[PDB]
Ligand code: SF4
Ligand code: SF4
Ligand code: FCO
Ligand SMILES: [Cl-]
Ligand SMILES: [Fe+2]
C-alpha cells in the first residue's frame with residue numbers, strides 16, 4: 001500500500017509510559033496513535049478519605065510536577081472548605097510553586113530534550129543511539145551543549161532547594177494545605193531562597209535562553225513542522241490578589257485564529273478510544289467517573305480524551321505565552337535578529353506557524369522561564385517575613401470545590417465533592433491529558449497526534465523526528481492517566 | 483574498579499524516585515552516572531528509544547547475566563493479566579511490568595526496589611485501587627524468583643538513601659566478591675527489607691520537639707513551630723527514618739519542621755498513616 005507503520009514503546013526522555021504509533025507515506029507522517037500504557041486510578045483511591053489527605057495523595061500522580069497537583073488540590077479544598085487564604089500565604093504558595101516551574105523547564109530542555117540535538121559522552125545512558133541521529137552542532141557547540149547539561153544538573157537541584165525551603169521537601173511538598181502555606185517565611189530563609197534564586201536567574205539569563213535560540217538556528221526546518229490544530233487553552237494561574245481577579249497567566253482559549261474566553265463548563269472527557277467503561281463517556285469533570293475497562297475493543301489508551309466545546313486543544317508554555325502574548329525577553333529579541341534575522345517585540349510576533357511548531361514549543365518554554373524569573377522577583381519583594389500564612393478550617397460535611405491552575409506542562413484542574421465529611425468524588429483534568437490523549441468519540445485526534453502529521457521521516461531506520469515532536473510538548477504520562 | 487551495569491524499570495511510579503536521585507548532593511548525579519554505575523537502561527533520561535532501547539538492555543543483560551543490577555520504581559499490577567502497566571514493545575508484542583520482572587528479575591545480581599510503591603505497594607495498592615498493585619518482593623516470591631531484593635523506601639526516598647545503599651553494596655562486593663558482599667548487604671536489612679543505616683532509627687525517638695511532646699505542649703496551627711506537631715497528625719511515633727538528622731534537599735528543611743511526618747517510608751503507607759492531619 002506504500003504506508004509503513006512504525007511503533008515506539010517506550011518513548012524515552014519523557015515522563016511515564018508512552019507508546020507512539022505512526023504511519024509513514026512519501027517520507028512524512030500521515031497518521032498517528034498515542035497510547036498511555038499505565039494506570040493507577042487516583043480518582044477511586046481517594047474516595048472515602050479525609051479531604052485534607054488529598055493535597056498529599058495527589059502529588060504522587062507525578063514526581064516531576066507534584067506542586068501543580070498540590071496547588072490545584074488546595075485551591076479545590078480552599079473553595080470547598082470556605083477557607084480564606086491569608087495574603088502572605090498566597091504569596092508563599094506562589095514561591096513554592098513558581099520555583100518548580102524553573103526546575104521543570106530546566107529539567108525538560110537540558111535533560112529530556114537536549115539529547116535530540118546534542119551527542120553526549122560515549123558512555124551509557126548517552127549511547128547507543130540511532131546511527132543516523134541527525135545531530136548538527138559543531139564540535140564546539142556540542143561541547144557547549146554537554147557542559148550546560150552538566151551545569152543544569154546543579155541548577156535544577158538548587159531549584160528544588162528553593163521549593164523545599166518553604167515546602168518542606170521536594171518531590172512531594174508538605175508545605176501547601178487548605179488555608180494557605182504551613183510555614184511562615186523568616187528573614188533567614190528568604191535570604192537562602194534569594195541566594196539560590198540568583199544563581200538560577202543568571203543561568204537562565206546567560207545559558208538556557210541563548211542555547212535554545214542558538215540550537216534552533218541550526219534547526220530552522222523544525223520551525224516548519226508540528227503545527228497540528230494551532231489551538232490552545234489557558235485556565236489561569238498564580239493569583240496576584242486575594243479576590244480571584246488578576247493572575248500571572250490569565251485564562252483564555254485560541255482556536256481557528258480566534259481568541260475567546262475560557263468557560264469550564266465546556267470541558268468534557270470522551271472515552272470511546274480509552275480503556276474505560278463505555279457508559280462514562282462525554283462527562284464534565286463535576287460528574288466524572290473513572291471505571292477502568294482494560295479489554296474494551298477499539299480502545300488504545302488509559303488517557304481520556306478531553307475536548308473544549310468539542311475542540312481538541314494543546315496546553316503548556318506555548319499555549320500560555322500565545323494567549324497572554326507577553327513581551328519577549330531582551331536576549332530573545334536580540335538573538336531572533338542576529339540568528340534568524342527576525343524582528344519581534346511580543347510573543348505573537350513570531351507568527352502562528354513558527355510558534356505552533358516543534359522548535360517553537362521549546363522556545364516558548366525558555367521564554368516563559370525568563371518571564372517567571374520576574375514573577376519570583378516580584379513575590380520576593382511582596383512577601384513579608386513573619387506574617388501568618390495559614391488558617392485552620394474545619395472539614396465540611398458536604399461541599400464541593402474546583403481548583404484551576406497551570407502546571408509546567410499546561411492546564412490543570414482538580415474537582416472535589418465532599419459528602420459525610422469524606423471525599424465522595426475527586427476528578428483530575430491535567431496538562432498532558434489535553435496534549436497526549438487519543439481520539440475522542442467523534443474520531444478527532446488529540447493535540448500531539450495531530451501535531452505529528454507531516455513530521456518528516458525520510459529514513460525509517462532513524463525516525464528520530466517522531467519522538468522529537470513528542471518531546472517538544474514535554475509529556476508526562478503519570479499526569480495524563482493518573 | 484568497574485561501574486556495574488544498571489537497568490532502571492518503572493512500573494506504577496510517578497518518576498519521583500528518579501527526580502529525588504537527581505537531587506543527590508555528594509556524590510552528585512553526574513558522578514553517580516560517570517563514576518559509580520553504568521546506567522544502561524532508564525527510559526526517562528536515556529538517549530535511545532523504543533524497541534532499540536529494549537534490545538540494548540537485553541544484549542547487556544545477556545552479556546552480564548547474573549552480574550547486573552535491576553532498579554524497580556513503582557509497583558507491579560497483576561490484574562487484567564498485567565495490562566495496567568505496559569512498559570514497552572518489541573517484536574510486535576507488548577511487554578507488561580509482569581513480563582519484564584519475570585524476564586530480568588531471575589538474572590540480576592540483586593534487585594533494588596526503590597520507593598514505597600515498589601517496596602511495599604504504597605499508594606497504587608491503597609484502598610480504592612483496582613489494579614493488583616503488588617510489591618516487588620511479593621511478586622518475585624510469588625513467581626518463584628529467588629534473586630535478593632533490597633527495599634529502599636520513602637515517597638520519595640531521600641537521595642542519600644538510594645546512593646548510600648548502592649555504595650554500601652558495591653563496597654561489600656569489592657570487599658567480599660559478589661556472593662560474599664550481597665550476604666553482607668542482606669545482613670544489614672531489617673524485617674521489612676530496609677537498610678538499617680538509614681531506617682534503623684525512629685523519628686519520634688529522635689525528634690527535636692520530643693521535649694514538647696513530653697511537656698504536652700502541642701501546636702494548633704501549622705505555622706506555630708514551637709510545639710510538637712502530634713495533634714496536627716505527625717506520624718513520627720510510628721516511622722523509622724533519619725530525616726530528623728540529614729533533613730531534605732540539601733538540608734534546607736524537613737517534613738516535621740515544615741508540617742508533619744506522614745510516615746512515607748513505612749509498609750502501611752498511606753492507608754495505615756491516614757488521616758494525615760489528625761493523630
Ligand atoms: S509527634 Fe512528631 S513532632 Fe512530636 S515529638 Fe514525635 S516526631 Fe516530633
Ligand atoms: S519526615 Fe516522615 S514523611 Fe517526611 S520523608 Fe521522613 S519519613 Fe517520609
Ligand atoms: N506539568 C505537569 Fe503534570 C502534567 N502534564 C500536571 O498537571
Ligand atoms: Cl509543578
Ligand atoms: Fe482524570
Ligand SMILES: [Kr]
Nearest residue numbers: 115118119120
Ligand atoms: Kr546531551
Ligand SMILES: [Kr]
Nearest residue numbers: 141142144145
Ligand atoms: Kr549547544
Ligand SMILES: [Kr]
Nearest residue numbers: 114145148149
Ligand atoms: Kr544543551
Ligand SMILES: [Kr]
Nearest residue numbers: 120121146149
Ligand atoms: Kr553529560
Ligand SMILES: [Kr]
Nearest residue numbers: 248249324326
Ligand atoms: Kr504571560
Ligand SMILES: [Kr]
Nearest residue numbers: 223340350354
Ligand atoms: Kr523563529
Ligand SMILES: [Kr]
Nearest residue numbers: 500503504527
Ligand atoms: Kr536518574
Ligand SMILES: [Kr]
Nearest residue numbers: 500501504526
Ligand atoms: Kr528524571
Ligand SMILES: [Kr]
Nearest residue numbers: 511512515516
Ligand atoms: Kr552525567
Ligand SMILES: [Kr]
Nearest residue numbers: 111504511527
Ligand atoms: Kr540525568
Ligand SMILES: [Kr]
Nearest residue numbers: 488519551648
Ligand atoms: Kr544500582
Ligand SMILES: [Kr]
Nearest residue numbers: 536569570582
Ligand atoms: Kr522493557
Ligand SMILES: [Kr]
Nearest residue numbers: 592630632667
Ligand atoms: Kr541484596
Ligand SMILES: [Kr]
Nearest residue numbers: 514644645648
Ligand atoms: Kr544510584
Ligand SMILES: [Kr]
Nearest residue numbers: 488553644648
Ligand atoms: Kr541507582
Ligand SMILES: [Kr]
Nearest residue numbers: 647650651677
Ligand atoms: Kr546496604
